[PDB]
Design a protein around this nucleic acid. Sequence first.
RNA 1: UGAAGAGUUUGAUCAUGGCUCAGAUUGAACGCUGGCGGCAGGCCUAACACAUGCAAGUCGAACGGUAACAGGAAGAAGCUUGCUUCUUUGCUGACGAGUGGCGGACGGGUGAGUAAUGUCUGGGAAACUGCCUGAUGGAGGGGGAUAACUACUGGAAACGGUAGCUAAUACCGCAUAACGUCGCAAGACCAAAGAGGGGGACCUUCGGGCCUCUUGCCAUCGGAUGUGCCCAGAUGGGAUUAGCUAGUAGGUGGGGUAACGGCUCACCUAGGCGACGAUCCCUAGCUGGUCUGAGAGGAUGACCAGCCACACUGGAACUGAGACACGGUCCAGACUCCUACGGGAGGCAGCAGUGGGGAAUAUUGCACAAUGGGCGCAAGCCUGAUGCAGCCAUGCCGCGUGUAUGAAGAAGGCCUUCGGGUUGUAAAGUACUUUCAGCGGGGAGGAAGGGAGUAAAGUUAAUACCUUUGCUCAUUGACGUUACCCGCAGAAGAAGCACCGGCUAACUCCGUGCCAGCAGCCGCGGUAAUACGGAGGGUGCAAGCGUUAAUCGGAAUUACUGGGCGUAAAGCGCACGCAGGCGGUUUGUUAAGUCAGAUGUGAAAUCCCCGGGCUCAACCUGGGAACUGCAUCUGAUACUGGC
Lengths: 205, 80, 85
Amino acid sequence: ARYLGPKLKLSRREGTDLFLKSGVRAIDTKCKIEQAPGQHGARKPRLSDYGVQLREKQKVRRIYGVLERQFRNYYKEAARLKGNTGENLLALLEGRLDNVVYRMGFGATRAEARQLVSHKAIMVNGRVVNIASYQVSPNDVVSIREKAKKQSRVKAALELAEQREKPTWLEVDAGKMEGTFKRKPERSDLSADINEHLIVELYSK
Amino acid sequence: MVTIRLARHGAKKRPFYQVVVADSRNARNGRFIERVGFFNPIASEKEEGTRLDLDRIAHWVGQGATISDRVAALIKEVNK
Amino acid sequence: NIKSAKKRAIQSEKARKHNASRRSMMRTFIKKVYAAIEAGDKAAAQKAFNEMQPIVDRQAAKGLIHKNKAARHKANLTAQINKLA
RNA sequence: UGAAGAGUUUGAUCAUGGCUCAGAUUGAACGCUGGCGGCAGGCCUAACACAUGCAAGUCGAACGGUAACAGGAAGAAGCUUGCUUCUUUGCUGACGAGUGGCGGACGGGUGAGUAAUGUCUGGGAAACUGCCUGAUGGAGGGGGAUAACUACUGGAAACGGUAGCUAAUACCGCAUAACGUCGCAAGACCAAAGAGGGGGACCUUCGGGCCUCUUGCCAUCGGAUGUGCCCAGAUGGGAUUAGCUAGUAGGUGGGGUAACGGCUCACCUAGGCGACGAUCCCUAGCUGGUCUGAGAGGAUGACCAGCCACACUGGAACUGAGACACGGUCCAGACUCCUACGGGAGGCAGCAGUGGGGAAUAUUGCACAAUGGGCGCAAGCCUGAUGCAGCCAUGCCGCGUGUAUGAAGAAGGCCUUCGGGUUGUAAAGUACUUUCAGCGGGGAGGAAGGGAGUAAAGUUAAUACCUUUGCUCAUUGACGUUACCCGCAGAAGAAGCACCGGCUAACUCCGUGCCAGCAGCCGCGGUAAUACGGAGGGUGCAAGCGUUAAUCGGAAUUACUGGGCGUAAAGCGCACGCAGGCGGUUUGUUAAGUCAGAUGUGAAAUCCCCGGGCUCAACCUGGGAACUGCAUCUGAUACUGGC
């Protein structure tokens, strides 16, 4: 599922921008995040003792568009070869084909990037791939199919990608819409909207 | 009759086949003396596709087990 | 269509009238050889055993008692004429 | 590179002992909702019963022959003397049925029985072993049956019975016969079939004398592989079953089987088996496997691979290489069906529907296309084997239902001493995006080969037979609307269900007023119900979401890893003691047990490593590993038992 409902009401409830429906009217003010302080008290009357990590667990899911059962499986595979769930977990999410199509700039949102992958428009090493959870490795070449290379939103997404922070671990050419992974993303750069004592005891908590 | 024969192995619309030595006598792919190869009708157009233990077959024929037209033709796929 | 198993009991009873009849004849032949030992001794027994020898092989030539019992009968009685003093 | 705990005894608190919830799950069932595709699995119940049709054949290159087709062979006539008719005929291509050889125990379905002579796993001795494969021998002679056909005949028939007649690769004798028989050994004895394609000189009544290769036939003795047999280690409950037994326990003599044993009989002997549970009774496919958790451990063995048993209910075993015979025999029982009435067919726990049983489990689908087996020397024929569709959120996995734009923020809704807030970029309005589905066209490969061409200085008598290559002609596709490509198509056809007093995520207002309707526990509802029903807003997961009778986790609260006995719950009121458990120490020796080393084995799938094939993976696999086991050989010589 993709939730398919109104988006900005989620980011406002998390006091954090989730990049949902981002671009154009969503850059430079009028997103209104953390600007409604209420008429009396913090509206935490109450509220739940486990609210952290519980809302942080929805945040880290919703901000990549990743579902519980797959996120729990990421937390299990991330431990292999001494990978550490405090490091490899985030680098696996950033290494997704739907995030790589978003970081190469062909989608303005991770949803828009996913909707290029599933709609049979994306290739990895010349082979067509429709799996948004495909893990891109330090030798993979990612590109678009000829039927989609001239689409309006794809060209508009590249006009936003050049204003976004540069992902130094990859290469891309916009005239062919073809790029290559050169390094795995690293925690010394890869930084997220999550607190440092949270999601390090994920599940059973 | 001990025979060198092709055994039922594969998937729906994707047959693979193995070759074994057995008295027949015995049922389908079971209770065989030893395995000697696999066919793979596709073999992905590669030399690491299709294998046959031509030297163990040479000790099992003679003066040994029988080999019929379609199984004596497996050597033509490895060529040989 | 056919089912030739449906013929095999009739083909067995029609043959039984000789193939089991000769089992009674062979059980009797042992009696004729022991009766030739009392008729008697080395100058009757080995002459009379040679009436039985070819009939046992001539029955075994058709199957029925061929696996061991035909040679068993010949060996059993060869040992009984060899026992004579 | 893995492993939440908590609640509940009170006015409070610490213990203990039960009980309970938050997570996984099924061949399931139930509720609401439900698309594209893929991989599996799909009567668990009545071992209840089956309509209507099938599921097993083949050889004319063994043979008697011929209902038909077609060509020869032979006669009689017309006179129209060149065109036809009549009366015969396996001689021959071919083949209906008949004789004769081989196949059907290939390969499926089902656990009723059995706590086992049974699965898993390891051994042993007394036997047989068709076809395959290896070596060594053999092929003269005589005689009698019989089908088809036809004439008779039982019965209303179904279904075939009889007689006359005739042949063998059908049958028996008379011959010949090995390293077989038995013995130290000489040696005696037991058997049977030719057939086919090709082909010259000589000869005929020219439907073979005779040459040549192939393949059979009869026998002896080995391998290869199975089949029969007995053991060992492994093993559901019950002691408010404690004794049980008469082929039970041992001997003597027959018979039996390929072989063994009491195996089966007849007689002598009285033993044999028991607390390591005999005896008896209830329940029961087993293991590869499956689910659960960090694992141990627990609950359990559909499908799957292998093995053992079963064929409506029951007996006997026979055939054959093989059945303790799904589509067999002699039938019997319970039955269904037929009979206008004199006796007759049969067993879906095959493939499919259906009556019944059930909360419940998919279509009387398509096809001899591919493959195997069977017959055939081969062309070829048989195949509900098999190979594929069809249906189902029943489990698992990849993926749609749009996306872009758009407000001092609309109308409408909810909350509010009515200020204001919130649904909300959500909507409308305007543009993208045709993924999936829909729809027309193009369209693989899965299909090789026989006949012909070929090709080896083939075989030979240079196109038989036999034998070889890659291709062509013509024939061989159920799946199928294949896969895949190209276009026509327009937001168009596409979203649920549960939850929001405390534990416990998200919560307020209305109505009801102890009523109605709720509840995992504390407990809800009498005028603020965060507990019912609604409403507006949130929480959760999503083609799924949920509710239950239950199993695994939480559960160390069944306690081995790993429980407890002063009272909370269990230590016998006491004395002695057989059978059991346990026992100092110096030496040797036994090797049951331990530890060490090998050779066999531990089926294939499959975990885990790892190479291919579809993106990942389910699946098909190619190579590895493990399965600490068990046996058979061999060391160490320490401890335990033994002496």
